[PDB]
């Protein structure tokens, strides 16, 4: 849940932290860990290609099983861990043969219960099934897009997908983006929504807390000079022009998708 | 606790309407439950179309079980997809007399 | 709820006399069992105010009987509340 801090400092007055007593207090499983150095948002040219990235805490990469190809071998949930690489919690799975993996933890997934992968699996949270074997109207997460590639959609904390129906070899999914789209029925999904549903209820409180997460400050275009940004310039405060990015692309309403090879997968979008 | 459950199954699955009935019987009786009545009203004609069909198979079995097996049964009915309707009622006593629809 | 069997178990445990089922001891014990059992219901149904009204009446009746029993015989009252953890 969400815990307010007492206003014992002005940097604490608006801290509302997400607290989970039930997640592991110890260190992650060492064999599923990879080193991961920060990038600063710089590509192989050493250029900033993504702004406001830098600093923050050193973190290891947890290797997540997004594919779930250990079918028909049951696993038990050893522990539910915090992951610094995502907003969702992760579950350490312990298979019958003793192999250990990490998966995205579902909300209704506790330590001790048994998870299954494959086509003859119960419709319980954490089980991975092909979309043709999941009853319509089941709330799912961790959606595969290409067959065998692993989950790409509905992975963030609290993420759920409505499985609306079917047309041929396609499952019709309503995503939390307000988007109805086709996915091949041989692609897999995991039952239930994703854990850490109150991720979006948190309040960082102070600028240093955003710095701890590797985010550098953001400087509005209107505060620049015209040589830096289309919004720069002016005696005093002034906008003057249609809002746009520093590269001159409009930022209020202009659509930017340009992908014809996937355009047939998309039923529709919602209007609000 | 005595329950009277009426199942409403697709006519395209009337051949397996027997097999699912025995599966439910086995599930109820393997949890120390009792099955007091088991009728079969056959291919009745619906008074209004359900899921575009006008005829469907009716099976009423008055069983006696507990809450956990009742939940298992209800989930089975939900996921069968051959059952197009289910009515689970609670009865104070056990009913074994032949119904008026058979 | 409480079954007939466990209600009779409480009655038998707190019988002052033979098959009395009406003394302050058995009344307070039965009310105590019912309240402690209804705690389970009201932990899952917090907004059940219409049921909570009756549970509050149970609490009030048990308090009335405990005060009456204390004023009648103090040894019996101090024994009863010690048995029931009150």
């Amino acid at each position: 849940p969400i815990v307010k801090a007492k206003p014992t400092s002005p940097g604490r007055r608006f801290v509302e932290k997400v607290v989970h007593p039930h997640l592991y207090k110890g260190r992650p499983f060492a064999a599923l860990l990879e080193s991961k150095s920060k990038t600063g948002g710089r590509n192989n040219n050493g250029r900033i290609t993504t702004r406001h990235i830098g600093g923050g805490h050193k973190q290891h990469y947890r290797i997540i099983d997004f594919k779930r190809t250990k079918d028909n071998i049951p696993a038990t949930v050893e522990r539910i861990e915090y992951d610094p690489n995502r907003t969702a919690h992760i579950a350490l799975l312990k298979y019958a043969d003793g192999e250990r993996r990490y998966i995205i933890a579902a909300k209704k997934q506790a330590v001790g219960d048994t998870v299954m992968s494959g086509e003859a699996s119960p419709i319980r949270p954490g089980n991975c099934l092909p979309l043709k074997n999941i009853p319509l109207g089941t709330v799912i997460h961790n959606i595969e897009l290409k067959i065998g590639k692993g989950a790409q959609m509905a992975r963030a904390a609290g993420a759920s997908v409505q499985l609306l129906g079917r047309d041929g070899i396609y499952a019709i999914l309503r995503l939390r983006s307000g988007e109805t789209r086709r996915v091949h029925v041989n692609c897999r999904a995991v039952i239930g929504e994703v854990s850490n549903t109150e991720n979006n209820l948190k309040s960082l409180g102070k600028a240093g807390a955003s710095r701890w997460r590797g985010i550098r400050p953001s400087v509005r275009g209107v505060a620049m000079n015209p040589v830096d940004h289309p919004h720069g310039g002016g005696e005093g405060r002034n906008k003057g022009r249609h809002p746009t990015s520093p590269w001159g692309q409009k930022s209020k309403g202009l659509k930017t998708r340009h992908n014809k090879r996937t355009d047939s997968m998309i039923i529709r979008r919602a209007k609000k | 606790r005595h329950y009277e459950v009426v199942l409403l199954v697709h006519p395209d699955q009337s051949d397996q309407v027997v097999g699912m009935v025995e599966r439910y019987i086995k599930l109820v009786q393997d949890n120390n439950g009792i099955i007091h009545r088991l009728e079969d009203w056959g291919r009745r004609q619906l008074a209004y179309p359900i899921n575009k069909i006008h005829k469907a198979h009716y099976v009423l079995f008055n069983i006696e079980t507990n809450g956990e097996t009742l939940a298992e049964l209800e989930e089975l009915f939900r996921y069968n997809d051959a059952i197009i309707r289910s009515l689970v009622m609670r009865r104070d006593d056990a009913i074994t007399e032949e119904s008026q629809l058979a | 709820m409480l079954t007939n069997s466990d209600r009779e178990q409480i009655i038998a445990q707190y019988q002052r006399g033979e098959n009395d089922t009406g003394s302050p001891e058995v009344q307070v014990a039965l009310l105590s069992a019912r309240i402690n059992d209804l705690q389970n219901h009201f932990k899952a149904h917090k907004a059940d105010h219409h049921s909570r009204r009756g549970l509050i009446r149970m609490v009030n009746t048990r308090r009335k009987l405990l005060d009456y029993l204390k004023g009648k015989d103090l040894g019996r009252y101090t024994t009863l509340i010690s048995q029931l953890g009150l």
């Binding site: - | 009426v6 409403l8 009745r44 619906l46 008074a47 209004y48 179309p49 359900i50 469907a56 009423l60 309707r85 009515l87 009622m89 119904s99 008026q100 629809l101 | -």
Partner: protein, 56 residues
């Protein structure tokens, strides 16, 4: 004596021509049996033994 939702042939003479429940001021039934009859009719309507309306 007793009334059930599987007495569809009995419920027919207490339903109207267009599927509406006939009132007690017409049928003459007691309040208690009228309540039971309404419940049984609603259950039969759910089980599709009786029509809700006459034009579905």
């Amino acid at each position: 004596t007793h009334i059930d939702y599987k007495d569809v042939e009995l419920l027919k003479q207490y339903i109207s021509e267009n599927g509406k429940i006939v009132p007690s001021r017409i049928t003459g039934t007691s309040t208690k049996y009228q309540r039971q009859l309404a419940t049984a009719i609603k259950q039969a309507r759910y089980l599709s033994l009786l029509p809700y309306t006459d034009n579905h």
